[PDB]
Design a protein around this ligand. Sequence first.
Ligand SMILES: C[C@@H]1N[C@H](CNC(=O)CCc2c[nH]c3ccccc23)[C@@H](O)[C@H](O)[C@@H]1O
Ligand SMILES: C[C@@H]1N[C@H](CNC(=O)CCc2c[nH]c3ccccc23)[C@@H](O)[C@H](O)[C@@H]1O
Ligand SMILES: C[C@@H]1N[C@H](CNC(=O)CCc2c[nH]c3ccccc23)[C@@H](O)[C@H](O)[C@@H]1O
Ligand SMILES: C[C@@H]1N[C@H](CNC(=O)CCc2c[nH]c3ccccc23)[C@@H](O)[C@H](O)[C@@H]1O
Lengths: 441, 441, 441, 441
Amino acid sequence: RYKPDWESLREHTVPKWFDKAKFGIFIHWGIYSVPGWATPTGELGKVPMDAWFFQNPYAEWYENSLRIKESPTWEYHVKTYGENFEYEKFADLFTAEKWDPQEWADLFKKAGAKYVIPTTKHHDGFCLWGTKYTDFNSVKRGPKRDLVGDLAKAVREAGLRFGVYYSGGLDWRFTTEPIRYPEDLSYIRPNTYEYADYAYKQVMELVDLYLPDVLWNDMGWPEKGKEDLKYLFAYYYNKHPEGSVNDRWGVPHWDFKTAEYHVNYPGDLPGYKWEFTRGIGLSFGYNRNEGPEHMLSVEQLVYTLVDVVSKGGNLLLNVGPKGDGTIPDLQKERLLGLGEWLRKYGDAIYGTSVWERCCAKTEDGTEIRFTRKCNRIFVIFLGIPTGEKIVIEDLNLSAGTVRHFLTGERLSFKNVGKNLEITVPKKLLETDSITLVLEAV
Amino acid sequence: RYKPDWESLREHTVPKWFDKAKFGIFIHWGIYSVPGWATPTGELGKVPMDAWFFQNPYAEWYENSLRIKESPTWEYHVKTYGENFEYEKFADLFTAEKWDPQEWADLFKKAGAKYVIPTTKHHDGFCLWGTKYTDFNSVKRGPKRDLVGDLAKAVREAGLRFGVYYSGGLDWRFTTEPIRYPEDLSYIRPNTYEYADYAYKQVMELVDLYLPDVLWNDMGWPEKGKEDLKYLFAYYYNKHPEGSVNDRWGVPHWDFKTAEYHVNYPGDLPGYKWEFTRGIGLSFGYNRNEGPEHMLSVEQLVYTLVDVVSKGGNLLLNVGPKGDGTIPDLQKERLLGLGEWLRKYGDAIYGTSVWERCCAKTEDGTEIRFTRKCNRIFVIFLGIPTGEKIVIEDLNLSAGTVRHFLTGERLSFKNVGKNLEITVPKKLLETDSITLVLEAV
Amino acid sequence: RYKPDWESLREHTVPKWFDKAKFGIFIHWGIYSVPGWATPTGELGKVPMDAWFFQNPYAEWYENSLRIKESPTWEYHVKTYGENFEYEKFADLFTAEKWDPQEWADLFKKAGAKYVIPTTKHHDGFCLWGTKYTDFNSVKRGPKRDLVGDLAKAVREAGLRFGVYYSGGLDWRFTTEPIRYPEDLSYIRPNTYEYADYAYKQVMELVDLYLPDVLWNDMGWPEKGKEDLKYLFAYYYNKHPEGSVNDRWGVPHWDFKTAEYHVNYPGDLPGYKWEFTRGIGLSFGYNRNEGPEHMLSVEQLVYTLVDVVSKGGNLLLNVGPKGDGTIPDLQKERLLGLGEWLRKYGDAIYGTSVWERCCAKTEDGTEIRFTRKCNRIFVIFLGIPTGEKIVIEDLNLSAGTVRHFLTGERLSFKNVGKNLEITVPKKLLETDSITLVLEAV
Amino acid sequence: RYKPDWESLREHTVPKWFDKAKFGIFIHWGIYSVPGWATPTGELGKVPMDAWFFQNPYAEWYENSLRIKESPTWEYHVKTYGENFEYEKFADLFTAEKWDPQEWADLFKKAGAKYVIPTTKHHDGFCLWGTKYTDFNSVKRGPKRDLVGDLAKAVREAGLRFGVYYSGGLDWRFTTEPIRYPEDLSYIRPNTYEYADYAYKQVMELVDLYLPDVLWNDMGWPEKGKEDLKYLFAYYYNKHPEGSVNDRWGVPHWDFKTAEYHVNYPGDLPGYKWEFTRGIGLSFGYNRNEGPEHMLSVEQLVYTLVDVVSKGGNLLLNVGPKGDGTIPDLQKERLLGLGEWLRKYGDAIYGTSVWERCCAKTEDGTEIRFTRKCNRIFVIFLGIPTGEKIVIEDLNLSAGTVRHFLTGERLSFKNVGKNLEITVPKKLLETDSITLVLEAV
Ligand SMILES: C[C@@H]1N[C@H](CNC(=O)CCc2c[nH]c3ccccc23)[C@@H](O)[C@H](O)[C@@H]1O
Ligand SMILES: C[C@@H]1N[C@H](CNC(=O)CCc2c[nH]c3ccccc23)[C@@H](O)[C@H](O)[C@@H]1O
Ligand SMILES: C[C@@H]1N[C@H](CNC(=O)CCc2c[nH]c3ccccc23)[C@@H](O)[C@H](O)[C@@H]1O
Ligand SMILES: C[C@@H]1N[C@H](CNC(=O)CCc2c[nH]c3ccccc23)[C@@H](O)[C@H](O)[C@@H]1O
């Protein structure tokens, strides 16, 4: 099997299904979904961190914001719900009246996602499964139902892989002071041995009850429980070798790394498996304030996915559900948009590998991304060029045959100097959707 | 802010209010106050430690003594309350029927104390605030009241600073064997991780509920929780920079050091801020056995305070209240005595700093202590000399002007050799109270 | 006293009573005794460990076996009790209806045991004393009685020493996955800080409530609680210097080492005090499947005891009681057999010490073991030789006088070369029981 | 770039060149090559370790064996060199008079090897480069030449990759006692801070002087120096990203695992990149006592390489040169035979990947091994079947087209039941060399 030690765990690497998958759905759903409110300030990495917690665009961070008197959230809360209204009271209002996990799994499958990962416990400590280590869970409060297990059955029934998100680094049920500055994160944590046991038992429980395909931890792991992971990871891998874990544990082992909005985004091939995550908007949890102005457009999403895939990554796109379990129309439509694109071009995404390079551009300034499948080379343009004459800068090919992807039509090309020229018959160009895609063999 | 690490915490030093304060009241009040009984054996540091726990003069140590069969306390307990009478039963008898925190704060202010610090939890583990981590507290038992919070409101309303005493190193609710020898202290402790979390959460709770001006720990901090202090101290300092902590945590940081009775008392300037603590008698908790024979006399107290202050310290004089919340007459009168002296001579104590030297004496053997305030030098005699001719040994002055403190009267002096001679007109001498005080400018 | 540190604890060594004792009774009694079933596969150390947990001969391991679907135990359980029948349900069926601790102590004393040690808590976590740290104990469930305390009173009343067995390394009340391979033991453990506190408090409790003569730990001590032993061992030794601990804590200190079936058995003098343990059969807990085919025969037992004693050890023979508290006839008879032998030859066992060598044999192949008592040398044959002429190989004696043990009869001997010859008059030989024993002076 | 900590080093994985190389040459050459002597007892993993160090088949362990008095090596030394001839004296005999690195590089290339790894310093502590950290090296002694350096130029000129072997775990220049049993290894080591520094500094120096392609450490890394490896690996990877390190350091990071003779040899696909190492005979260092009986045949070597390769490993075949720098005829001839088979079947070995499974066998028991290149599946028979009808037990194929690798000839086949049947005309079977190779698309 695997032995509880880093040298040994190192023998386990990102499983094939995950590398081949390329696209997954993240779900931040919780009692924060009820107030479903945040100031849509901007993207993490571009909003200054001395103001970020005070005008937090992450709506799942509502309680932390609510603990900061006079901050937009405090303002909003008191005026909408009042002061005699504690954050926890939202667990009772959290009723998932319209929820149907099969509908969700159908939606994510249609969107082309090959795996799904919900928040089983977010920073506020509310648990979406009937854990036996707390009564602040979806079985005893609000939904009166094992959201995690029920969704796992649906997803798996649809043929998708199922993972779990857990906030091991933060649990506000163990702290009183909110996070006001990034520096606060170094001391405002549970900090106790009790919390380390708790996190450990809760993840062991998720493993025993649902044997997830991915262990997606967040905000690091309690310093006192770090050595525990040697055991937990061995326990997990020995019951499920195709399982996997991310890089937010702060220990030697991890199967694939992560990046959030701008934070840790690679500009070129990074050299290890990784995964990109972001919201359809600026929040993970639902934000009734966000208008389309804040969300990506189907095209941006397709471009986001290609840039990610060309660099060896998986896109973990987040969906932010309403307290009643429905998925906001704006998010549903973009998901489908993406699903439509993937239905046409999926063969140049799923099962692919990185090429010698990820990137290129045309004389005219259109960005190009590359992907490979044995001897095939997908050339994906982030847009559809206007003219039939395309000039790719700094690129030569020895392939000899270059087809227009969707139609299969052999095309004319030649390496003119340090560039590459191809003529893409407008009949064909007009045929593509959001991306001109060519296959070089 | 401050970062959770020793290098960083080092940036925080004893706040000015504390250095300027010079005098505070300690309060050891608890269910031990009910039996209010101890053998007044002698002072810590002069009674031999192979007999000390067997005839403990610290009445707040009643339960530890009671656990030693056949020891004066066992003897006394069985004959007064009987064997079917567990120590814990005192939490029910602890009713504070006559307690009025405003009266206390009035008394301490009149006594000239600038800060007050009660035991929130002593070695027996009984808590004087409605902590949420145990039901063995004053809110659920006996007083049916938040003694800590109510006293903090009173003290602060009187304009005094408020601190907290916590027995982090010992809690007998987690041990069964009593301490019989000083060696027992190295292994007879809670010792568990559970206790370390407990202590941590309880002090965090005191910080969140009352934001004390001083964190006065006792008997060291649980070895498993030591690293926790980096976080707790940063958390505390970041919510309250003028706060402070003592030196009984056993970690790198501390704001001022401590000394108890003879233990760690400095003979001369120590070179860091420190604080002296002792009972009006030989016990901290009330001891109905102590007669005036065991207590200091107003004069001794005044001398104690001057010796302390001259050496850069603060005197933390303990008051040992009765189970019914009243302050025993013997202690009240001495407190007032001291208050009277401070009303006359306070200007040569509060706000002062140490001088080149702390000490001197006269040809006749009267001890002299020094204190400074910019260009002024207070010369405080521990007594009032008989003759108008005073000879101070081994002292010269370049000041040129030396006034009799209370009256302001310029006096005649000259440096005769290696000594200093001053003539203090008996009109003036007769005017002083417990101390002849001169001001040199 | 003893200080909580290894250097200091080292000052404590195996007490005299224990070295002089030579024989003790082990008792594995628990709710596992109810199903009282195991496949009698063979001896630990000879059955291959890749099959051992799947056909475990240790019946007290029933629950671990029951957690392995389709294993003889699963098979058996479902067919006898059914699937809707959890292992814990056995705590209710565990009623000790026929139990009489005085009868037990009488039996063990008659068997010649000088000390007794029951399992207070085995791997399944069920406790046989009214611990205050769990309700899964004999006081709240099944027997409705403090088995540990009641047995300690009986044993001590019979004049025997009393010890305690505790499963510190394993507690299945904190794990879900069974042990399938020896490798699983390195990660399938409680692993939490909570468990370390628990084990610590439970052993401290056994010490405070019964002050055992031996602390017999099993399966190592929780890694997070190892440093705790410095304190626990000092606490124990300071209340009971004649107490003792075994070697299954995984820390620097231990008073005597252990060996189980073939595991760690010494072939010759080891050089430190140790103790041998095994079942009358192949299991510790009762196994209604075992027939005499699986048990040792009185003679084998006597030989087992002599081989152990000659090598400086104590034999800790286990008795496996029924759920109703009675001792199975097969075990009772062997115990008595042994008791009978010890009544005749005890003087060449109790109070003895090892000699220059432990072993020898005759020209004919009869094994011989040696033991000492000052100037006396017991020569114990594992059998009774046929002829009056005995030839011991590779042995000479300078003693001059060699008596036939039981009768006292001086015998004729001489050192012929590298061997030793003695003539044992058949009158005498016919007089011995399972062993020819000679005394050389 | 890479940072100095396990988590970041995790990002580095086995370089593509290494994974594709499949075959390398190990060279154990040292002053131990002069005596060039050993008892050819057997293969590691097959010889009992209670005898192993006493009849050591690893001629490079000569000094260790010489230290064990009365051992075949000791007897042999005294008669050949004399009792007054210290092992270190061999450094003066080690002259490499007939050495020609280009000649070696060539032989290795003609042999089919893609990288070479020489012992820069084996257990005896003598270094084959002008290290500045010791005078016991080839520059100041014996050859008065930088063997490591000159060999690196030559191997690289031949266009092969160059790695280094280093004995971090052992250095007999720091010990006096010999290794007698595996156990001895737990304490007979340098053990000093000094040695940990020596080792770090020397590998650093190897990295600076030669930037090797592989850092192949042996016998673990000194405990006191383990943390230095985070720094050394980061430094190394930052200077040479495509470099690699083995698994014998005893720390979390490694790019590929190792197996030695029987020790750690995978029965099937292991899940990680590894490499098999062994001598052509039973020794790494040259052994004049080995005749062909002790060596592999060209066929066995081929089978070896195929089996290793089909399981995702590399074969690191050892060559043991003579003190004069020549390669023994027996060894050279085996290398060349392997080179010829690879010249012929290289395509089914180099740059391949594992397939669904590594193994299969014919109805009549010929072992079959698999490899792949994109859609091409190579089918390697360890030997050439006598008849034209071949039956592969338990293998069905979907490919529709199965050619004869050497010729390209399309062959007739059909999945019959759970086996696969194929007709290979004898004209082709008569053309293969040691293996019948089929190609399935
Ligand atoms: C997927 C998202 N992960 C967030 C945690 N993010 C990180 O640790 C990424 C880097 C980062 C540094 N400081 C931060 C403050 C807030 C959010 C992210 C970060 C969570 O705070 C958020 O609720 C959501 O679950
Ligand atoms: C202010 C007083 N502090 C005491 C603890 N004192 C100390 O740690 C000072 C030094 C000392 C060493 N061994 C001791 C035993 C008993 C009391 C004091 C000490 C407490 O035991 C006592 O109840 C009271 O709260
Ligand atoms: C006296 C017996 N001790 C056993 C634990 N034994 C040991 O740790 C000895 C060595 C050993 C190694 N692996 C094992 C697996 C099962 C039992 C023993 C061992 C227990 O498992 C058993 O229930 C019984 O209490
Ligand atoms: C390539 C070879 N590596 C050997 C070290 N091998 C190992 O550490 C793994 C196999 C092994 C385990 N215990 C051993 C004891 C002696 C030799 C080998 C081993 C070296 O001892 C040998 O000189 C040669 O360099």
